[PDB]
Structure 1
Amino acid sequence: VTEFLKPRLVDIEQVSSTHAKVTLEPLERGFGHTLGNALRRILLSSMPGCAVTEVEIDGVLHEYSTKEGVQEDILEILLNLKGLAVRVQGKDEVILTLNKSGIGPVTAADITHDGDVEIVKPQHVICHLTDENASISMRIKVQRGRGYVPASTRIGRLLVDACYSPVERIAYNVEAARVEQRTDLDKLVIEMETNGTIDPEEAIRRAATILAEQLEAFVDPEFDPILLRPVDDLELTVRSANCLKAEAIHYIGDLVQRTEVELLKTPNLGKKSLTEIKDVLASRGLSLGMRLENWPPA
């Protein structure tokens, strides 16, 4: 009936800015490997981190392009952007602007200082401007997520493979814990090598939180579909579409219910537009003043 001795974060040894040694004190034997593996498994794949997902470089259209005045090709640049370690306050998407003219390396330190955004490694090279009349202006999109989400996991913009997880490497040691009482206790030492996005203690409490939350106990057509299509599917003129949306007509079902009289009474619609709308509707077997009687169901 001896109640179990529970752990609590006891020491943090920051070997460096991105390498630490967390230690949970007084754990009953065998629990070293149990928690060691549960935690190592959560940390190495379930951690939340910011990562570059899209990039908009001026003058560049396809990632295969190479730039006038830039040493490395756009592909190498995106590959460089993959390694952009950013820690953002409380947001799931932030746009970073990078304007740089001159000769020499364009590092992360040249990124426009945003109040929320923290740049872990400012000396991180993104580019190399060759001639002194060369310059880059790009918009780097940084988003919050989980795990490795490739660019293939799908406009004149480019997509970059997302490596959301903040942690590079995890290691653990079981080591016998001190204290003359009981004697048969161990201490789990988790050696972390992160990218600097996340603090050791919160990484541990988040791995633990995910574990605990996984353990949350163990317990024991009629009608036409076209009516629910957005009005944009009708491919009207920009003006007509905008007018209809301005009249709270967002779907085909909304449009076919209105009558000519009612539509012409609206501030922004004239004879031209109504003619166009009747034409596009008639072209798909539809019209104005259509009764569907039951708008809508659920």
Structure 2
Amino acid sequence: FLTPRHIDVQVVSQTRAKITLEPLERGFGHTLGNALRRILLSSMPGCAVVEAEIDGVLHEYSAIEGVQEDVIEILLNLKGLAIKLHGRDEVTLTLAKKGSGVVTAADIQLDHDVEIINGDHVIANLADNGALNMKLKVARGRGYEPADARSIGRLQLDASFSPVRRVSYVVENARVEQRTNLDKLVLDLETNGTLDPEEAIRRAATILQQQLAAF
């Protein structure tokens, strides 16, 4: 009958991180690990590019000059981009580059509340024939929302944020001199850098307490 306090955040990489709270009793560790993964893998507040308007091409299919990739490929690269938002729901971003050079995720003009995580994700490839110009409108959603359920230049996109990708739990055997079997758990939270893993655990804690306060 002990409460899990004094957690330890073992950060071994910028994506994966290990967290071991406390060794539980015989039969509790699998239960808490399964409950925590069942609530963390359901829905977490993330951000993705839901709207995108290009001033060079009217729709999102026909190609333009200067851009090497297709417009389907550039919207796929935009919806596959990890973005961090602190205290704003919707923020308008821009993207413009001229010259024979590649463009990466660091080239987007950020703000005080807009933070970029990845820098190796190549956005597109340019040339000396033409250039591109488009505006980015992102949003923070709770769960999956398609373009069908949620002027002429407004092009809708699907909500494709992924706040957490790869998680599991590994049980061990510890000893804190109070019982026979002390089972501790290791949780490898692999995220895209858009949010803190401890803040995600706190968010899942608020979801479970708001869901079990009615019972």
TM bucket by the smaller chain? over 0.9
* CA 118–83 in structure 1, closer or farther in 2 if over 3 Å, else same: same
d(CA) in 2 for partners of 1:153, 1:66: 28
* Alignment deviations for residues 31-61 of structure 1 (CA, whole Å, 9 cap, x no partner): 2122212211221122111111011112111
C-alpha contact (below 8 Å) 2:79/2:161 kept by paired residues: no
Q: CA RMSD in A?
A: 1.6
Is the 8 Å Cα contact of residues 24 and 183 (structure 2) preserved in structure 1?
Answer: yes
CA positional deviation for 1:87:
0.7
Counterpart residue number, 1:16: 13
Q: Which has the higher contact order (CA 8 A, sep 6+)?
A: 2
- Distance of aligned partners of 1:48 and 1:216 in 2 relative to their CA distance in 1, 3 Å threshold: same
Report what 2:107 is aligned to: 110
Structure with higher Rg: it is 1
Q: What is the rounded CA distance, in whole Å, between the counterparts of 1:183 and 1:104 in structure 2?
A: 64
- What letter corresponds to residue 194 of structure 2 in structure 1? T
Question: Partners in 2 of 1:45 and 1:139 — Cα distance?
Answer: 31
Deviation string, structure 1 residues 142-166 (Cα, Å, up to 9, x no partner):
1111233233333312222212331
Percent identity between matched residues is: 71
Q: Which runs of 4+ in 1 moved over 3 A?
A: none
Please tell me whether residue 88 in structure 1 is matched to residue 95 in structure 2: no
Could you tell me whether the CA contact under 8 Å between 2:54 and 2:153 is conserved in 1? Answer: no
Matched, 1:78 2:75: yes
TM-score normalized by the length of structure 2: 0.92
Q: What is the aligned partner in structure 1 of residue 137 from structure 2?
A: 141
Counterpart in the other structure of 1:207: 204
Q: 2:124 aligns with which of 123, 127, 131?
A: 127
Aligned residues of 1:9 and 1:23 also touching (Cα < 8 A): no
**TM-score normalised over the length of structure 1:** 0.68
Q: Is the 8 A contact 1:45 1:146 kept in 2?
A: no
Question: What is the alpha-carbon distance in structure 1 between the residues aligned to residue 14 and residue 204 of structure 2?
Answer: 20
SS of the aligned residue for 2:13 comes to: coil
Q: Structure 2 stretches of 5 or more lacking a match?
A: none
Larger proportion of helix: 1
- SS of residue matched to 1:41: helix
2:178 is the counterpart of 1:178: no
Partner of 1:230: none
Q: Which runs of 5+ in 1 are unaligned?
A: 219-298
Matches within 5 A, 1:1-298: 4-129=1-126, 131-154=127-150, 155-218=152-215
